[PDB]
């Protein structure tokens, strides 16, 4: 008997920690220690998907004496309207009602066109440069920040101002840096709301300002803008990095994709399913039980913390045959859980898929000899950031 303690070691730079796969083999749910509270860890696909759809399991903490959280986690939960368990039902319902129509098919069609031309220009700059080059800086970082500038209706150079703010806000190692960074986010977005009130355009804040004939306060609108800024580029950056790394590890699939860019949608779904970095602490969706829930033969009691391991579940052999293998020829693969599921299912997931599809349609056809310029083992997953990520991806081509 030895209580497993999150985060688990991973000897590889990607994939699932061996101890978590070991727990998955024993059963769907295990009690584990963490850096803070003990929690139930749920690792099998069927159970994680069922619990994500169970509205007794919520983001907000119902306990009278809530355990302490990093400033970074507190900001993340507040941006998702989860900071007050008594008001989360109404506030979270309103948040989704106001954000979902911002990602209309009309907007997504226009953005797909602009995204595809942008990737073309990004890859032309890449192809013309002298290697070694940092692919993270010149490609992975640049497309999703371009997209957030488009959503917010600001000049592209603004991403040079806000491009490290998700990382800084979500730095769990430094509460002062996290709070100082979030203040910069807030000031920028309040500036932006005041501008869009007199100079609207075809963008998110302008639509929120017009919503319900102006019923929302500037603070309410800026809060929604902050969620889009802070949730809306960094995780996509990380998936371009992971997808590149995964395709580099699978040359037969990569050659298939280069020969037939029509496989990119399928490749993107495999990248999202298998794209887990380092110790994979970001591939856990945290929840609290607001009522008792039975999982197998285990009772989760009201107030218990629950970690839903979407990464481990996406590797589950019971849901994906040969779950550890990258295979963009899978016939009718189950829907992966990388965007979550249920009440908090990722709001930008169709836009994120358009970005990743546009990149991987193009990348290895534009740069067929692309490869790392450094050993894989030298790439360092940033465990202190809630969103993880690599800081650089040196390549030659
Ligand atoms: C590949 C890139 C992305 C991944 C892997 C991802 C992943 C996720 C996941 C797993 C959740 C669920 C969190 C939970 O259940 O508590 C989520 C929620 C969310 N995502 Fe995404 N996301 C991505 C891109 C985006 C983009 C591009 C946007 C917007 C521009 C966005 C906006 C949001 C928002 C606002 C939420 C909060 C949903 C809620 O709490 O109701 N995400 N995302
Ligand atoms: C709102 C989020 C940014 C989306 C989710 C994906 C993430 C990621 O890929 O890094 C974030 C990591 O931390 C979490 O709690 C998550 C798993 O819910 C995320 C919160």
UniProtKB/Swiss-Prot annotation:
State the needed cofactors, names only: heme
CDD domains registered for this protein in UniProt: Cyp158A-like
Q: Which GO terms describe its molecular function?
A: heme binding; iron ion binding; monooxygenase activity; oxidoreductase activity, acting on paired donors, with incorporation or reduction of molecular oxygen; oxidoreductase activity, acting on the CH-CH group of donors, iron-sulfur protein as acceptor
Give the pathway annotation: Antibiotic biosynthesis; pentalenolactone biosynthesis
Q: Which UniProt keywords apply?
A: Antibiotic biosynthesis, Heme, Iron, Metal-binding, Monooxygenase, Oxidoreductase
Q: Which reaction does it catalyse?
A: pentalenolactone F + 2 reduced [2Fe-2S]-[ferredoxin] + O2 + 2 H(+) = pentalenolactone + 2 oxidized [2Fe-2S]-[ferredoxin] + 2 H2O
Q: Does the keyword Metal-binding apply?
A: yes
Q: Which Pfam families match?
A: p450 (PF00067)
> Which annotated residues bind heme?
346
Top EC class of this enzyme: oxidoreductase
Q: What happens when the gene is disrupted?
A: Accumulation of the precursor pentalenolactone F and lack of production of pentalenolactone.
Q: Which GO terms describe its biological process?
A: antibiotic biosynthetic process; pentalenolactone biosynthetic process
> Recorded E.C. number(s)?
1.14.19.8
Q: Which family does it belong to?
A: Belongs to the cytochrome P450 family.
Q: What does this protein do?
A: Catalyzes the final step in the biosynthesis of the sesquiterpenoid antibiotic pentalenolactone by mediating the oxidative rearrangement of pentalenolactone F to pentalenolactone.
Name-wise, this protein is Pentalenolactone synthase
Task: List the source organism.
Answer: Streptomyces arenae
């Amino acid at each position: 008997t030895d209580l497993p303690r999150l985060p688990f070691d991973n000897p590889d730079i990607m994939g699932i920690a061996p101890q978590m796969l070991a727990l998955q083999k024993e059963g769907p749910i295990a009690r584990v220690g963490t850096a803070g509270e003990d929690a139930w860890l749920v690792t099998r696909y069927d159970e994680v998907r069922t619990l994500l759809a169970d509205r007794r399991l919520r983001l907000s903490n119902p306990n009278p004496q809530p355990s302490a959280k990093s400033a970074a986690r507190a900001f993340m939960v507040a941006l998702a309207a989860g900071d007050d368990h008594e008001t989360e039902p109404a506030r979270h319902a309103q948040m989704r009602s106001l954000l979902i129509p911002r990602f209309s098919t009309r907007r997504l069609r226009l953005m797909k066109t602009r995204i595809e031309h942008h990737v073309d220009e990004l890859l032309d700059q890449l192809a013309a440069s002298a290697p070694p080059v940092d692919l993270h800086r010149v490609l992975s970082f640049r497309l999703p920040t371009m997209v957030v500038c488009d959503l917010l209706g600001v000049p592209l150079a603004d991403r040079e101002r806000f491009g490290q703010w998700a990382r800084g806000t979500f730095d769990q190692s430094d509460n002062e840096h996290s709070a100082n960074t979030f203040q910069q986010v807030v000031d920028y977005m309040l500036e932006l709301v005041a501008r869009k009130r007199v100079e609207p355009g075809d963008d998110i804040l302008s639509e929120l300002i017009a919503e319900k004939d102006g019923a929302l306060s500037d603070a309410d609108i800026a809060h929604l803008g902050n969620a889009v800024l802070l949730f809306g580029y960094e995780t996509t950056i990380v998936r371009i990095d992971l997808g590149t790394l995964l395709l580099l590890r699978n040359p037969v699939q990569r050659a298939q994709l280069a020969e037939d860019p029509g496989l990119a949608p399928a490749a993107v779904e495999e990248i999202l399913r298998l794209g887990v970095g380092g110790k994979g602490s970001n591939a856990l969706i945290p929840r609290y039980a607001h009522g008792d829930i039975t999982v197998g033969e285990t009772v989760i009691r009201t107030g218990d913390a629950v970690m839903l391991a979407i990464g481990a579940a996406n590797y589950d052999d019971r849901a994906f045959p040969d779950g550890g293998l990258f295979d963009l020829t899978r016939v009718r693969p189950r829907s992966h859980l990388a965007f979550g599921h249920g009440a908090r299912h990722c709001i930008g997931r169709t836009l994120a898929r358009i970005e990743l599809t546009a990149v991987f349609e193009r990348l290895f056809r534009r740069l067929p000899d692309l490869r790392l310029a450094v050993p894989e083992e030298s790439l360092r997953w940033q465990e202190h950031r809630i969103t993880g990520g690599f800081d650089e991806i040196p390549v030659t081509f």
